[PDB]
A paper describes a structure:
The biosynthesis of the lincosamide antibiotics lincomycin A and celesticetin involves the pyridoxal-5′-phosphate (PLP)-dependent enzymes LmbF and CcbF, which are responsible for bifurcation of the biosynthetic pathways. Despite recognizing the same S-glycosyl-l-cysteine structure of the substrates, LmbF catalyses thiol formation through β-elimination, whereas CcbF produces S-acetaldehyde through decarboxylation-coupled oxidative deamination. To understand the molecular basis for the differences between LmbF and CcbF, we solved the X-ray crystal structures of LmbF and CcbF with PLP at resolutions of 1.7 Å and 1.8 Å, respectively. In the active sites of LmbF and CcbF, the PLP is covalently bound to the catalytic Lys270 and Lys260 residues, respectively, to form internal aldimines.
In the LmbF active site, the N1 and C3-hydroxy groups of PLP interact with Asp233 and Asn205, respectively, and the phosphate group of PLP hydrogen-bonds with Thr122, Ser267 and Ser269. Moreover, Trp150 interacts with the pyridine ring of PLP by π–π interactions. Although the residues lining the active-site cavity are in comparable positions, Asn205, Phe236, Leu83′ and Pro302′ in LmbF are uniquely substituted with Tyr195, Tyr226, Tyr72′ and Tyr292′ in CcbF, respectively. Docking of the external aldimine intermediate of 4 into the active site of LmbF and 50-ns simulations showed hydrogen-bond interactions involving the carboxylate group of the cysteine moiety of 4, the C3-hydroxy group of PLP, and Asn205. The dihedral ϕ angle between the Cα–H bond and pyridine ring of PLP is stably maintained around −70° to −90°, indicating that the Cα–H bond is aligned parallel to the p orbitals of the conjugated π-system. The dihedral angle of N–Cα–C–S is −65°, and the octose moiety of 4 is within a pocket consisting of Leu83′, Pro302′, Thr303′ and PLP. As a result, the ε-amino group of Lys270 remains within ~2.5–3.5 Å of the Cα H atom, and the distance between the ε-amino group of Lys270 and the S atom of 4 is less than 3.5 Å in the calculation, suggesting that Lys270 probably acts as an acid–base catalyst to facilitate the C–S bond cleavage. The in vitro enzyme reactions of the LmbF L83Y, W150A, N205Y, F236Y, K270A and P302Y variants revealed that the β-elimination activity is abolished or dramatically decreased in most cases (less than 10% compared to wild type), except for the L83Y and F236Y variants, which showed 21% and 58% activities, respectively. Although most of the multiple-site mutations at Leu83′, Asn205, Phe236 and Pro302′ of LmbF merely reduced or abolished the β-elimination activity, the LmbF L83Y/F236Y variant catalysed the decarboxylation-coupled oxidative amidation to produce 9, as well as the β-elimination reaction. Leu83′ and Phe236 in LmbF influence the selectivity between β-elimination and oxidative amidation.
Numbering used by the authors:
A (entry chain B): 16 to 427
B (entry chain A): 16 to 426
The structure:
């Protein structure tokens, strides 16, 4: 499990094309050739679950736990664990009175359900303010009936956007005649890894309060900052929006805790928004599924292994950022072509000048097995995105292989 | 476990109201009093999984299997398994060339994604033809931008609707100026338990072909007919629509195989519709989740237990329909107040005349612990729906309690 070929040979090889993105074939060809493959382009930890988690899944054989459950909020032993755990972990305002609900099919799907909820009763053209680049929010915005109007997040900024970026996007809503339905923020940001500021959050809150527009917080990486980076807690700083029906946060558990297949998460915030989400806008569409996974996670999350695993992941993200930096320096990259902000486990690489970046991307897989992400800034300048949150057993050889590849890159 | 109170005490008791339907409180009060509770209103088998299925989850510890998958169609070992299994079980037309895809968050959710895919590119008002009553299709139709235009399915018909019912619905689309986007059918029908006819399916196919409208088949209960009832196979009879991009079926595995929490199912049919569903209209919304559950179910489906479990469920459903008929005759109900058609595991009870049916429904829980479903026909006449697909360990005491309740009813 020191590389990722096994994952593609099992989950991608099929008698149908597994997806039509060009990277699908790059990954297949590398994996089927049984050559080392390193997937640094998607933020997963597929190589292992945390200690104790699979055991917790098996322990739930003690009682029947594979039927549908009779709560629109998820399994109560999980829901109340998340309420306590999130309030402590994110340092929620004790004077706010939020409601917490389980999401059991992915927080991207919870965002979709939240956005279609906010389209209800809105005949007029509507906008969602969202970061660009963002983690797949754009299609959920379009598919739920809104216009995506993005605010720029520069890759170079260790703190992500500034209020001026939000204002520019708001002014495009003004001139396009689009009613703003939601402001979506991602303070520990995928893909750039910025840690967003109280300044920016206050600008978001002021716009929310002025226009009566809810804020949607994606906290997937709140718990995965670098060791020397204290995450900005948007729910703490925006606590006054809870009682105004202007705040909902979503936070995947399966990302931080290396169980992406279980698709468990928390939806929390204003009680009207969250109760409407949970029943009307989620449980009419999907079943009350995930009984066993929720019970296993309630037992696991209530114990001692979550803190140990989180501390491990944050120490790895820090060490891997440092190892990538020195590896790429030894390969000949200039210091300023390697950025790591510590708000989420991503390192950003400026691709070598003058080559077609998609070609460099493919040749890195073909020649050395490493698949990186590709993002672009507001002027379409390309950046490679390197996910750092793999176990060291995979990241150490992946880093070495990327060092081999980057020595073939020309920096002038 | 010979009742259901354990399930409500674990999954409904909380510091928030679990849902605002009045039945939530009836269920809580009975369960929290630790008096026998029998949930016969939802088609689940929460009391137990089939032999070998939980063991299959353990066996998957042998390799890492809790990350995201790199296929928009689900885990290949499951998808391949379902393709072969469905083609044999439903006797698909060997001349058709369908595509099969895994659904991993519920087939009601797959229907939602299919319906919103069919709204794409349609500014004009559009309709979905659907049965009334149906299993929750109506809100997916509305929430994906269509107008629900229902065709009547009479509870009394052991074969469900006739072509005239479909035509009446189509004519309402015509007079309202609604463009038909989809015809949804449920041949082994929830809630009435009819087994729909080749006649009706032929009328559906003729309408689909004439108007170029895809058919969406819900086959949740295809494998759960009574012992003496061969299910009508819509995909077999509609095989010619596959190549025309006019057929998609959805089939939950988790109902038949008593693992509803795993929310695994199959989406199958026209390759353009199914590939567009799988990627564009599902994987941009949902993560490629369910690795371990899909792997466990693929392994389990490769053994001998699934066929044994299915035979057992069908035997139980048939025995339970018989036991309810005898129990309710002894309680004083007329024969025409107790219907079981055998197309799915439901018995229909006509409530006592002159009582308020929601009151009778509540009092049956309060006094005897039995929760029945409530449906109505096209003239709003009420019927209780009794789910039969529970283990006998639960159903036998449930039937005794329902007999006790029904003896208090006036016929």
């Amino acid at each position: 499990l020191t590389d990722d070929g096994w994952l593609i040979r099992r989950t991608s090889v099929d008698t149908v094309r597994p997806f039509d993105d060009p990277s699908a074939q790059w990954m297949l060809d590398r994996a089927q050739a049984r050559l080392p493959l390193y997937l640094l382009h998607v933020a997963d930890h597929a190589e292992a679950t945390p200690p104790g988690l699979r055991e917790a899944l098996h322990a739930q054989d003690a009682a029947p736990c594979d039927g549908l459950l009779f709560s629109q909020y998820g399994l109560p032993e999980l829901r109340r664990r998340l309420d306590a755990w999130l309030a402590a972990d994110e340092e929620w305002d004790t004077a706010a009175e939020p409601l917490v609900s389980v999401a059991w099919s992915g927080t991207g799907a919870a965002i979709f359900d939240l956005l279609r909820m906010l389209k209800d009763g809105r005949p007029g053209p509507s906008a969602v303010l969202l970061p660009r680049p963002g983690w797949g929010y754009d299609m959920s915005v379009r598919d739920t009936g809104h216009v995506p109007v993005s605010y720029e997040v520069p890759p170079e900024s260790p703190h992500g956007p500034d209020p001026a970026h939000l204002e520019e996007a708001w002014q495009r809503c003004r001139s396009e005649g689009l009613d703003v339905a939601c402001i979506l923020i991602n303070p520990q940001h995928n893909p750039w890894g910025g840690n967003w500021t109280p300044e920016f959050l206050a600008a978001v809150a002021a716009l929310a309060e002025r226009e009566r527009v809810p804020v949607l917080v994606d906290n997937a990486f709140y718990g995965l900052t670098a060791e020397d980076v204290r995450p900005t807690s948007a729910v703490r700083l925006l606590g006054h929006l809870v009682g105004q029906e202007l705040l909902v946060s979503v936070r995947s558990l399966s990302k931080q805790f290396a169980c992406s297949g279980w698709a468990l998460g928390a939806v929390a915030g204003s009680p009207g928004l969250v109760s409407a989400y949970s029943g009307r806008w989620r449980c009419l569409r999907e079943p009350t599924a995930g009984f066993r996974a929720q019970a296993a996670m309630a037992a696991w999350l209530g114990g001692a292994e979550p803190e140990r695993f989180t501390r491990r992941r944050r120490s790895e993200a820090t060490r891997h950022a440092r190892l990538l930096r020195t590896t790429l320096r030894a390969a000949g990259l200039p210091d300023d072509a390697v950025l790591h902000h510590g708000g989420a486990p991503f390192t950003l690489l400026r691709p070598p000048g003058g080559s077609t970046v998609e070609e460099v991307r493919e040749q890195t897989v073909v020649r050395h097995g490493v698949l990186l992400g590709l993002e672009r800034d507001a002027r379409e300048r390309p950046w490679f995105k390197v996910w750092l949150g793999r176990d060291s057993s995979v990241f150490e050889p992946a880093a070495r292989a990327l060092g081999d590849a980057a020595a073939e890159w020309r920096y002038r």
